[PDB]
Amino acid sequence: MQIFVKTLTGKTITLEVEPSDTIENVKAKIQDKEGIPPDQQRLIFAGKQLEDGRTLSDYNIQKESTLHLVLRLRG
């Protein structure tokens, strides 16, 4: 199952993922592909930030959905 992830600079990432995968799970897959550390990722969909505990189906994320990736900005 391919999902879409849109970053702050408007850059999209395609990701193979299974509905049972946790949010920690998906963040870990983002680190693999794009070198973004999980602790620095904010995963936002439908108007709410996802939480590590829940799976993809607990926010009803399915098939061609596009989640937002917001970097935790510190400096």
């Binding site: 702050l8 600079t9 408007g10 936002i44 108007g47 996802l50 939480e51 917001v70 900005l73 400096g75």
Partner: protein, 157 residues
């Protein structure tokens, strides 16, 4: 106005994003902040008060403490950590401690202004922005995120 022509995507709780590309010097004048570890706050102090002193940042850090007291528990960015409100304040309030988006969010609610963080290139080009609060950019406090580690101040020309 160009800056006000930019459309913003709300993504959570009055937090908006946008991904243009332009040169900061065209629309903004840059007021540089020292490499303190307090530059985030200094940046606020430069835009929020008439006269900015080197010790003003502590007034915005004072506000943060007051703001965290009542907003931390409902902040989206904070939620995605597992850090308690108390665990957070005994580190954020320590000297030379970095800040950014979390504190931008909290403060925008507290001082009732809207705060924007403009992510910039080594080519001094903006590529992304986060707005905290429903304001237009002109009447908003504009900050520039320079490395991936520094904040300076911006005034519209």
């Amino acid at each position: 106005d160009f800056l006000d022509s930019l459309i913003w995507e709300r993504v959570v709780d009055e937090q908006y994003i946008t991904n243009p590309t332009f040169c900061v010097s065209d629309y903004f004048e840059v007021i540089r902040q020292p490499g303190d570890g307090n530059c985030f706050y200094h940046s606020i102090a430069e835009l929020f008060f008439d006269v900015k002193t080197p010790s003003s940042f502590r007034k915005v850090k004072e506000h943060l403490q007051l703001a965290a007291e009542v907003y931390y528990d409902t902040e989206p960015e904070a939620v995605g950590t597992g850090i308690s409100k108390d665990e957070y304040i005994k580190v954020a309030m320590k000297d030379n401690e970095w800040g950014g988006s979390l504190e931008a969010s909290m403060l925008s609610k507290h001082l009732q202004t809207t705060i924007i963080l403009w992510v910039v290139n080594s080519t001094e080009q903006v590529t992304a922005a986060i707005k905290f609060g429903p304001g237009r950019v002109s009447t908003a406090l504009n900050l520039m995120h320079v490395g991936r580690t520094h904040f300076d101040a911006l005034r519209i020309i």
